[PDB]
Symmetry: C2
Subunit: 365 residues, 2 copies
């Protein structure tokens, strides 16, 4: 293996295949990057066991075929550390890989290419192609509601559900829920799969909001995403995801509407004097006003009052302020509509102007 | 105590004073036309003063600093904040937002400001900032020789000098001041140096500094900073500087830095060993690790002396080069087992000493 490639052309791909954390990986090879030369193409591959990213770059200069693995982070830093404009001459020499540029010489350790795991050896069953914007909309709309280190491992992921013309995402930690749907334009067979946390994070990192369409392939145990010269593949979590339609409020008698930003700032201010552990906040509902209250064990008190329009009977409801905030921060719109039934039941939250995303939050006290 | 003050006028001071129970609180005090906000810890106490253009009533109390700051920050741009003491509680009102905070009584709030100055001098913020930035990185961190964890401020005639050093390396910086003072050296602790840096906005407002036998105070505008000093015999910087360095090497700071940084990647992660071969108008930099990965850099420099190999921890050199931020560096070398001085080629005001390594 021998290639010579300009520094800024090699730097972008290396970034794209870079691991989220170089540190703390028990398996030695997982810390390495697989370099492979074929006719006119250099392929850089990074991987943990769960997922794998592959970047391809066309070689305009002399090259010779071969493959090897070298420590990814060291290799990245050496290229980054080289001056703007540099030509990087890589060459395999037995045990070592050599990197040469200007008057700088580097000798790296290797592990053999054939011990490098291949997590992209499966057959796709369903394929669709959509704009990056739409996948980004779906992931951002729900990602915050994913569980963290929950014993029901499937909750730690996000559900991608195709249903006819729509692609739907669902995330839920069991105390709250997010669901988002967007039409994708070609009718698909009904199919739902669970993508793990790190997969969702990587899938978001791909999407630059470019004009390049995103090609998505789904297998029975794996999922692959194409954007331009970059391919991302990940394993699928195996679990029985909970039905989102069961968690949505059955019959919500009362409806409350207000400005998202004003409601957010008011919740945020009250949250300062909420119990640091449980973050409970009381919501007092009146026909023309909502009163937000918070106190802590030291009996410090917060009180906000806003002008809202609300058709229903008056009531008190207890909420975790953080969950509401996560929801209001996710909406980023003009007006929010809250649907409530009673003090002991769940409450739906949504943008008043769009039905495409819904949020369900559990009550307190 | 009652005051009403515009949000953006209260926000800057609160920031300035930000930093067991009562130490978490902020002391608010009203006098004729003035609100004083004080933040403190058993080491350093710092004060902000703001003039009140609106109705007020005198009094004092303490309230949790962080909560009080967040409530003001959290209020909308342009807001009028009405504070009022009500028995056990302090009340904060703006628009239809209302907050009741816990208090602890003003008279339990510790005071670190009662002491007599012995030496007073005034200088520009730029100069103090130059002195602190030039050496701060060389301060020790959590060392058992506790005095090393600080920085030395030494007055010597017409100059103010800072020195920072761990056992391994050293930084010294000197900057002239207008009035000749008596010889005096004191050790400001880590958190003091950090706060002193925080004060300096690079404004035209002169900085007034007062030194007592066990404390130091700094005045900039309406902001006052005071800290305990560290007790200890700080080592003599003049003993560590190379005595008579025959060999002098000159290089471009940035090129030397990037080359040392690239080699450092394949240095031993624990000891950071790096070898420097110096020869006629050239340096060769070398590094290897336990896995026998190797790095090698060569640069055009200017060097006329005898040829030698010398080794140093690369972090220490990089830290120095990163601190210099200049066009060219002069390195003063004596031999392979001796320490080496580093300085900006264009200014003698800051010197850096780094020891050798037998690889």
């Amino acid at each position: 293996m021998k290639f010579t490639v300009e520094r800024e052309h090699l730097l972008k791909p290396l970034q794209q295949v870079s691991g989220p954390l170089g540190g703390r990986p028990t398996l030695p090879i997982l810390g390495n990057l697989l370099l492979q030369v074929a006719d006119g193409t250099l392929s850089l591959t990074g991987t943990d066991l769960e997922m794998e990213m592959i970047a391809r770059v066309t070689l305009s200069q002399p090259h010779e075929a071969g493959a090897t693995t070298v420590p990814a982070r060291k290799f990245f830093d050496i290229c980054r550390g080289l001056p703007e404009g540099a030509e990087i001459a890589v060459q395999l020499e037995g045990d070592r890989m050599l990197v040469r540029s200007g008057r700088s010489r580097f000798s790296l350790s290797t592990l053999p290419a054939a011990d490098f795991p291949n997590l992209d050896d499966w057959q796709s069953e369903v394929e669709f192609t959509l704009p990056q914007a739409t996948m980004k909309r779906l992931i951002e709309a729900t990602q915050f509601s994913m569980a963290h280190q929950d014993v029901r491992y499937y909750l730690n992921g996000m559900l991608f559900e195709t249903e006819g013309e729509e692609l739907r995402t669902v995330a839920t930690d069991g105390h709250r829920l997010a669901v988002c749907s967007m039409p994708i334009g070609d009718s698909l067979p009904n199919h739902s799969v669970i993508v793990p946390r790190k997969g969702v994070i990587e899938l978001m990192r791909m999407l630059d909001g470019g004009d390049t369409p995103l090609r998505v392939q789904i297998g029975s145990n794996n999922i692959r995403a194409h954007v331009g010269d970059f391919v991302f593949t990940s394993k699928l979590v195996d679990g029985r995801f909970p039905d989102y339609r069961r968690v949505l409020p059955k019959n919500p008698d009362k409806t409350l509407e207000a400005g998202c930003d004003s409601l957010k700032q008011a919740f945020a201010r009250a949250a300062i004097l909420s119990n640091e552990k449980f973050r409970g906040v009381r919501l007092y509902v009146s026909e023309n006003q909502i009163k937000i209250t918070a106190n802590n064990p030291e009996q410090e008190e917060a009180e906000e009052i806003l002008d809202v329009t609300y058709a229903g009977t008056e009531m008190e409801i207890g909420f975790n302020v953080s969950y509401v905030l996560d929801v209001l921060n996710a909406l980023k719109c003009e007006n929010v509509r809250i649907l409530l039934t009673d003090s002991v039941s769940s409450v739906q939250i949504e943008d008043a102007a769009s039905q495409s995303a819904a949020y369900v939050v559990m009550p307190m006290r």
